[PDB]
Amino acid sequence: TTITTYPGVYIEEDASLSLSVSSSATAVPVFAVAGDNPLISGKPYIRISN
């Protein structure tokens, strides 16, 4: 609802929501690690990509 208060040219853009579903990754695993392992100790989690 643009309020016209001065003479001139006003610019409007459509802001109504555009909705669509996107496919996510369905194979992300989580591995369980023993307590004594030094790599995991002292940190919340470790992300490994290769």
């Binding site: 609802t1 643009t2 309020i3 802001a15 109504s16």
Partner: protein, 395 residues
């Protein structure tokens, strides 16, 4: 006219024509400790306009700590439009409290009321100073909750929105000595007292850095109200909007904790990884079916104020059938425009709105004899979808 001499006479149709036009619905007023450059409520068009008229800084005029300048910066950062400033000077006298409803009413465009101060005691005094006759006239109040557990106590619950928690910013606004009102003059006159004041100023500076730069969130939310009203209508809930120019929220919240407050009417500021910092909540302080969501309450405030302003040109027109037809058509066209914009729920206009004015449907002979003209207006506002429920079946 009554002809008197032969010739040609000219008559102009002076009968009334009525048209209700939408106005602004998001001009706020800020009440707090400000330091104007020149020695009343002042209109400010932008952040640059505020700087040219006020001394931006984190120190109140002489010492006190003020977040008003920083809060106003966030308000303009979040899409806020022109606003009004009500500077408070010297000690908080009782005379200032009594004049607050009066001064606000003189400025005819004020719609939202915000207190950008940080002190809880100062905010409580300002909120209570707002008379019930002020908020009930079509004014909305935005307040900051001081606690997660209990809600605010307000004179008019239906006209109030409360938010929690406060927001953090990285750097405040620091001003040179020439900007602080009483410092450059004081330095050259008596450095001894200047050192005395600076120690308190330095004492204020490190406490803010230590505890973090906490800014009340009501100032930020006022900008969100104007940004939402510019993009979508007043009927769109001001929630699910990403905050801008912020560092962190004062306290992180979980889904379980918010559900406890949402029943009490405290709107939450949540952080979502996929989206960032967003406003999660659109409820007022009243929990009945009518006035529960902010968009429903504020939409009525706009419609009532717009229609009331248009009827001021009918306050002495003849009370007969031709007047009622013009009045009905003007309101009908206004409501029809609102329905097509999506502000009212219904497949056909008969289910979205209705207007009734007539000799035997709304008034009677005695009301006409006494000068009363009664108009009935009904609107079916659209409520937000606070909860989305997905029911999956294997059919």
């Amino acid at each position: 006219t009554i002809p008197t001499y032969p010739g040609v006479y000219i008559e102009e149709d002076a009968s009334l024509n009525l048209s209700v036009n939408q106005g602004n619905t998001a001009i706020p007023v800020f009440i707090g400790l400000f330091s104007p450059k020149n020695t009343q409520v002042t209109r400010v068009n932008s952040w640059l306009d505020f700087t040219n008229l006020f001394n931006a800084g984190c120190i109140a005029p002489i010492v006190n700590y003020t977040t008003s300048s920083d809060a106003l910066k966030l308000y303009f950062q979040n899409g806020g439009g022109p606003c009004y400033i009500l500077p408070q000077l010297d000690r908080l006298t009782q005379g200032f409290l009594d004049s607050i409803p009066e001064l606000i009413k003189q400025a005819l465009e004020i719609t939202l009321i915000v207190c950008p101060e940080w002190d809880s005691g100062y905010q409580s005094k300002i909120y209570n100073s707002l008379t019930s006759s002020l908020l009930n006239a079509g004014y909305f109040l935005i307040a900051d909750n001081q606690d997660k557990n209990t809600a605010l106590i307000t004179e008019v619950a239906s006209q109030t929105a409360t938010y929690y928690p406060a927001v953090k910013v990285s750097q405040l606004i620091q001003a040179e000595d020439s900007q602080i009102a009483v410092l450059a003059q004081l330095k050259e006159k008596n450095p001894t007292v200047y050192q005395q004041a600076v120690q308190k100023i330095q004492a204020i500076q490190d406490e803010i850095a230590a505890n973090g730069n906490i800014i009340p969130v009501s100032a930020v939310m006022a900008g969100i109200y104007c940004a939402t009203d510019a993009s979508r209508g007043v009927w769109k809930a001001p929630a699910n909007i990403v905050l801008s120019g912020i560092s962190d929220v004062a306290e992180r919240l979980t889904d379980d904790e918010q559900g406890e407050m949402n029943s009490k009417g405290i709107n939450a500021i949540r952080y979502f990884s996929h989206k960032g910092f967003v406003v999660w909540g659109a409820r007022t302080l009243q929990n009945d079916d009518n006035w529960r969501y902010i968009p429903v309450r504020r939409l009525f405030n706009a419609a009532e104020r717009d229609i009331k302003q248009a009827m001021q040109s009918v306050v002495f027109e003849p009370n007969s059938q031709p007047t009622w037809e013009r009045v009905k058509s003007a309101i009908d066209n206004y409501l029809y425009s609102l329905w097509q914009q999506g502000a009212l729920a219904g497949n056909k206009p008969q289910e979205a709105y209705f207007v009734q004015i007539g000799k035997d449907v709304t008034m009677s002979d005695d009301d006409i004899k006494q000068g009363k003209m009664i108009v009935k207006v009904g609107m079916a506002a659209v409520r937000p979808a606070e909860f989305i429920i997905l029911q999956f079946s294997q059919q």
